[PDB]
């Protein structure tokens, strides 16, 4: 039976163009389905969606990030996709459960993850060789990493860290290497109860900065764009970033760059499969089955992914991930291979950012600067941070 399906997403023009081709491919294969696409840049997208939420007129397939996933989900606007994953509609046989965890709110699958990124240590291989150093990514520890950064400074005259900013990403990574977490599951306070974890993390940051193998805050504040960034300029041999950012860095840099598993990820599976973005279906949709079939095509059809080519992150299906590599250049292939390697020892996505998250972020950023400026001790800072952070979170 003929049907019209409304499909919405955000991005820039390249994404619009290949997404349109994917849609045309779907209509070519399924001529009973007629698709009306709505798209905009990020700013405009959410503005355009708000009045459709209002009138119960959301498109049948809508692209989401985790933050709006949580907002729409909490307002009961989104259809649980779980049954579609059981009843044959969305095939998840080549999609590990951990890939999809980022779309799960309150045990409901409100969004289907379209691609993932994973934290990495990205290295300039030429500068590793100039220093005569090497990274054994399997099992290296925080001490090994510290020693690496000193060797980089002493023997190659460059930094071994880009600064591990922002701290709201990398201190939580640290805590996970230690079998700990930053936020409580319920969002009401800090999970970790030992301030020594904070002290240990930031005492290391100080050592690195004091040893001149990580930037001082003023240096960090001068970096405007990616063409200024430390790895791009050869100022650091090391940059800490999600896997997708490697593409940007590699196109801008002369030197061969590689992605490495960060230190001490192994024992507690500290890395997570972070969703790039998700497709959701509103409860108001009159075509929820056809919307789910489109989502399935989008994630499992290999011909379609020959067009998408990992632009929305590394494909959640290991079959699709492997199938696109022949068409990807080396740098894009490196990203896929990295994530595939990381995914062998990895944890589910974190839960949704709790309310008050933006203030905690700023608090931790200001706290880090004061520590590196030595305006406050790491000991003292651990205490005031816990107190302020818990007061913010206690409000939710
Ligand atoms: Na390739």
Swiss-Prot record:
Disulfide bonds: none annotated. Pfam families: SBP_bac_1 (PF01547). InterPro entries: Bact_solute-bd_prot1, SBP. Induction: Up-regulated by growth on type I rhamnogalacturonan. It comes from the Bacteria. Belongs to the bacterial solute-binding protein 1 family. May play a role in the degradation of type I rhamnogalacturonan derived from plant cell walls. This is Putative ABC transporter substrate-binding protein YesO. It comes from Bacillus subtilis (strain 168). The lineage of its organism: Bacteria, Bacillati, Bacillota, Bacilli, Bacillales. The gene is yesO.
